[PDB]
Amino acid sequence: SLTDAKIRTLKPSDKPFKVSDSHGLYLLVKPGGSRHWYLKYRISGKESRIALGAYPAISLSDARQQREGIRKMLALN
Amino acid sequence: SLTDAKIRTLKPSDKPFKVSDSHGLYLLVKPGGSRHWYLKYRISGKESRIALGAYPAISLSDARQQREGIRKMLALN
Ligand code: NA
Ligand code: NA
Incomplete structure (x- = not known):
């Protein structure tokens, strides 16, 4: 799970990476400095993702509510 | 649009009623005192709704993020 402090401690590296909160929500951190929220979802064997916005404009709390x-x-169905 | 003050000023009446925020989000207020968030959505000519939680446990700000x-x-498609 994430906390804001854990997120802010993250630094862009030399390769993109994701840090997961839970239930499909993650933050993608790119070498150029982008930090963006995504939610991954799976339907009939295919997985896609949708962007939920840039951090910190979209806070961890906000991203979580969007996920909820x-x-x-998605529960349908 | 709603504000928390507008919501709190609402009172249960003798008939259920809805007050809209925007973009499908509304609060359903029932005579027995229930205040619950719903988001309505329309797909190929059929409209349904999903419950987003009870107010005030789910705040106006939270409901808005869930809507976003x-x-x-839904944008897909
Ligand atoms: Na990186
Ligand atoms: Na009522």
Whole structure:
């Protein structure tokens, strides 16, 4: 799981990487400095992702709420 | 659009009613006192809704973030 302090301690490296919160939500951190939220989802054997916005404009708390909304929608079905 | 003050000023009446924020999000207020968030959505001519949680456990700000996540998911397609 993430905390804001854990996120802020992260630094861009020489390769993109993801840090997971839970339930499909992750932050993608790129070498150029981008930090962007994504939610991954799987439907009939195919996995895709949707962008939820840049951090810190979208906070960890915000991203989590977006995830909770999306999970309720994905529940169908 | 809603504000928390506008919501708190609402009172249960003798009939259920909805107050809209925007973009499908509304609060359903029932005579027995329930205040619950829903998001309505329309796909190929059919409209349904999903519950997003009880107010005030789910704040207006939270409901809005849930809506923003869901709208990104509905965008497909
Ligand atoms: Na990186
Ligand atoms: Na009412």
